[PDB]
Design an enzyme around this catalytic site. Structure first.
Site, PDB file in Angstrom:
ATOM      1  N   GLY A  11      45.916  43.233  53.218  1.00 20.00           N
ATOM      2  CA  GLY A  11      46.531  43.923  52.101  1.00 20.00           C
ATOM      3  C   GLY A  11      45.999  43.407  50.778  1.00 20.00           C
ATOM      4  O   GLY A  11      45.991  44.133  49.784  1.00 20.00           O
ATOM      5  N   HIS A  57      35.085  47.032  53.572  1.00 22.19           N
ATOM      6  CA  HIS A  57      35.969  47.434  54.660  1.00 22.19           C
ATOM      7  C   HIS A  57      37.214  48.179  54.175  1.00 22.19           C
ATOM      8  O   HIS A  57      38.046  48.599  54.979  1.00 22.19           O
ATOM      9  CB  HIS A  57      36.354  46.240  55.553  1.00 22.19           C
ATOM     10  N   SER A  85      43.033  42.325  50.713  1.00 22.89           N
ATOM     11  CA  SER A  85      41.645  42.715  50.937  1.00 22.89           C
ATOM     12  C   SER A  85      41.055  43.518  49.784  1.00 22.89           C
ATOM     13  O   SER A  85      41.688  44.441  49.275  1.00 22.89           O
ATOM     14  CB  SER A  85      41.556  43.543  52.221  1.00 22.89           C
ATOM     15  N   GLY A  86      39.831  43.168  49.395  1.00 23.50           N
ATOM     16  CA  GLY A  86      39.158  43.862  48.309  1.00 23.50           C
ATOM     17  C   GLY A  86      39.549  43.364  46.931  1.00 23.50           C
ATOM     18  O   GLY A  86      38.926  43.735  45.931  1.00 23.50           O
ATOM     19  N   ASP A 110      30.184  42.488  52.271  1.00 25.98           N
ATOM     20  CA  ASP A 110      31.443  43.216  52.188  1.00 25.98           C
ATOM     21  C   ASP A 110      31.802  43.459  50.725  1.00 25.98           C
ATOM     22  O   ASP A 110      32.617  42.746  50.137  1.00 25.98           O
ATOM     23  CB  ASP A 110      32.546  42.422  52.893  1.00 25.98           C
TER      24      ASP A 110
HETATM   25  C1  LIG Z   1      44.027  41.867  59.527  1.00 19.09           C
HETATM   26  C2  LIG Z   1      42.540  41.727  59.241  1.00 19.09           C
HETATM   27  N1  LIG Z   1      42.335  41.253  57.874  1.00 19.09           N
HETATM   28  C3  LIG Z   1      42.493  39.977  57.654  1.00 19.09           C
HETATM   29  C4  LIG Z   1      42.333  39.328  56.365  1.00 19.09           C
HETATM   30  C5  LIG Z   1      42.529  37.945  56.269  1.00 19.09           C
HETATM   31  C6  LIG Z   1      42.387  37.279  55.055  1.00 19.09           C
HETATM   32  C7  LIG Z   1      42.675  35.859  54.946  1.00 19.09           C
HETATM   33  N2  LIG Z   1      43.295  35.224  55.930  1.00 19.09           N
HETATM   34  N3  LIG Z   1      42.322  35.194  53.855  1.00 19.09           N
HETATM   35  C8  LIG Z   1      42.043  38.006  53.928  1.00 19.09           C
HETATM   36  C9  LIG Z   1      41.847  39.368  54.010  1.00 19.09           C
HETATM   37  C10 LIG Z   1      41.989  40.042  55.218  1.00 19.09           C
HETATM   38  O1  LIG Z   1      41.769  41.372  55.178  1.00 19.09           O
HETATM   39  C11 LIG Z   1      41.837  43.059  59.472  1.00 19.09           C
HETATM   40  O2  LIG Z   1      41.306  43.618  58.441  1.00 19.09           O
HETATM   41  O3  LIG Z   1      41.814  43.524  60.618  1.00 19.09           O
HETATM   42 CU   LIG Z   2      41.031  42.799  56.553  1.00 20.54          CU
END
Ligand SMILES: C[C@H](NCc1cc(C(=N)N)ccc1O)C(=O)O
Ligand SMILES: [Cu+2]
Ligand SMILES: [Ca+2]
Length: 223
Positions: free
Chosen positions: A175, A40, A177-178, A84
């Site tokens: 943020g 994503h 993420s990844g 993912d």
């Molecule tokens: C905001 C949402 N992402 C949410 C999100 C939540 C978590 C977590 N709570 N551990 C980890 C990574 C993410 O990317 C989105 O991508 O829309």
């Molecule tokens: Cu996310």
């Protein structure tokens, strides 16, 4: 990262920042030319930034390298977030040193209770928005499959695992993420999703890397 601590400059050498005029995702360096991140996080015009601590200041040790190609898993489903995972090939090989190093892929999956290190430049607030300048760290355990599924009924696939704290207050967030989830020197997870951030009974969900080792190796070998 919510409820974490300042890692310390270059103490997480395999951590990378995906940049497109601003930091938008994390990633992990697995060899001199490849980075593993989340599907994503895909988008064009990605610049990979290695050896970073303060992402807003050039402090030295940074290496900025353009992504030559991004490979999203063919079976990635944007609705369920299953599979993912994404591979990014660097335009040129990174110079590996003590500040920029690769992380090993797992040979076996991790068991519940295993302590791991999660890191990133994501949001640090559960209620609100606050992005840090320097890299944040969080030690969190992998939760049991039963607790994970009870927390997210019918949303957890065999390619996901939960890690974190059910009491809330500590979790990864937008943020991050990844980014990497490293346990005993091996990359076991990729920051994927969760309900809000650091909410009680809503732990973070991560891509289970041990299920993709063969896919990663075969894909890297043919590209
Ligand atoms: C905001 C949402 N992402 C949410 C999100 C939540 C978590 C977590 N709570 N551990 C980890 C990574 C993410 O990317 C989105 O991508 O829309
Ligand atoms: Cu996310
Ligand atoms: Ca910097």
């Amino acid at each position: 990262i919510v409820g974490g601590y300042t890692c310390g400059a270059n103490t997480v050498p395999y951590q990378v920042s995906l940049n497109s005029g601003y930091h938008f995702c994390g990633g992990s360096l697995i060899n001199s030319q490849w980075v593993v991140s989340a599907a994503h996080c895909y988008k064009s015009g990605i610049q990979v930034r290695l050896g970073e601590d303060n992402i807003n200041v050039v402090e030295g040790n940074e290496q900025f390298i353009s992504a030559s190609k991004s490979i999203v898993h063919p079976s990635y489903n944007s609705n369920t977030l299953n599979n993912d995972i994404m591979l990014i090939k660097l335009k040129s090989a990174a110079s590996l040193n003590s500040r920029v190093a690769s992380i090993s892929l797992p040979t076996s999956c991790a068991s519940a209770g295993t302590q791991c290190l999660i890191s990133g430049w994501g949001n640090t607030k559960s209620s609100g928005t606050s992005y840090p300048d320097v890299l944040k760290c969080l030690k969190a355990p992998i939760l049991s499959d039963s607790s994970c599924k009870s927390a997210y009924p019918g949303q957890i696939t065999s390619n996901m695992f939960c890690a974190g704290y059910l009491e809330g207050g500590k979790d990864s967030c937008q943020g991050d993420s990844g980014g990497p989830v490293v346990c005993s020197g091996k990359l076991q997870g990729i920051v994927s999703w969760g309900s809000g951030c650091a909410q009680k009974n809503k732990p973070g969900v991560y891509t289970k890397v041990c299920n993709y080792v063969s896919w990663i190796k075969q894909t890297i070998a043919s590209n």
